[PDB]
């Protein structure tokens, strides 16, 4: 019964699948942020000396054995799958740097007048209204941690408020006064169980937060991402350099607002 079935499997093929990554998340900042093309890796912003923006690089070395690249290509190209997973990891760390970097990160490039605290510590609807009023000109969307979103929803339930869920493209999302709320785990949660909420206006024509990249680069794989052969070493390992160029820019101080010290709760 079982032995016969196993023996039969010995002459059959199993259905496998691409390696599955638990880490892969919904990189909402990359999808929502408009991307403006820069030349020479430099972008000038005339602010009321102009600020200079240099493209940062997220790069890594992909090492693949020569045997893997030669033999294991029958059902699917293993070097291509390794490249896809490498690009996915690159995009994840890009999303992390768009928020947490000390040079162009959103959490650190916010004007001191635009950062506001919470009156009591939980993210009450009053704090949401204050955050909305900070960026009062065409507010694009809110970005928060899942714990933060849970905390705001518990304040809504405690106050007897059921906010309408906006339908953004094919996705239904929570919203506050028409402003869609997007979850992002890259936003830090401190050991005191506190986080931050970001309200953004997006667009170059609206003087909002934009993303900076450079498409067209040579040896390009995906837009603004390039893969280059580096060589084979004495142990017969093929090395590839994969590089993605990216930056962020807030055109005017009022395009970004931060609600700070949000008590998400344990």
Numbering used by the authors: 18 to 65, 252 to 469
Can you provide the manuscript's text about this entry?
Encapsulins are a prevalent protein‐based compartmentalization strategy in prokaryotes. Family 2, the most abundant class of encapsulins, is further subdivided into Family 2A and Family 2B based on the absence or presence, respectively, of a putative cyclic nucleotide binding domain (CBD) inserted into the E‐loop of the HK97 fold encapsulin shell protein. In this work, we report the characterization of a Family 2B two‐component encapsulin shell identified in Streptomyces lydicus (Sl). Through heterologous expression and purification studies, we show the differential assembly behavior of the two shell components – Sl‐Enc1 and Sl‐Enc2 – and demonstrate their ability to co‐assemble into mixed shells with variable shell composition.
Negative stain transmission electron microscopy (TEM) analysis of purified Sl‐Enc1 and Sl‐Enc2 highlighted that Sl‐Enc1 did not assemble into regular encapsulin nanocompartments. Rather, a broad smear is observed, suggesting that Sl‐Enc1 does not assemble into homogeneous protein shells, forming irregular aggregates instead. That is to say, the Sl‐Enc1 majority sample yielded a symmetry‐averaged Sl‐Enc1 shell map while the Sl‐Enc2 majority sample resulted in a symmetry‐averaged Sl‐Enc2 shell density. As Sl‐Enc1 cannot form shells on its own, the obtained symmetry‐averaged Sl‐Enc1 map has to be treated as artifactual. However, we were able to use this map to build an atomic model of the Sl‐Enc1 protomer. First, Sl‐Enc1 exhibits a clearly defined 23‐residue N‐arm, not present in the Sl‐Enc2 protomer. The second major difference between the Sl‐Enc1 and Sl‐Enc2 protomers is that their CBDs show different relative orientations with respect to the HK97‐domain with the Sl‐Enc1 CBD being tilted by ca. 23° compared to the Sl‐Enc2 CBD. Thus, Sl‐Enc1 protomers can exist in two different states, one with clearly resolved N‐arms – as also observed in the symmetry‐averaged consensus refinement – and one with completely unresolved N‐arms. The discernable N‐arm states result in substantial differences in the size and charge of the two‐fold pores. For example, slightly unfavorable angles between Sl‐Enc1 protomer‐protomer interfaces or the presence of too many defined N‐arms – only observed for Sl‐Enc1 – could potentially propagate if too many Sl‐Enc1s are present in a given shell, resulting in an inability to form a closed compartment and a propensity toward aggregation.
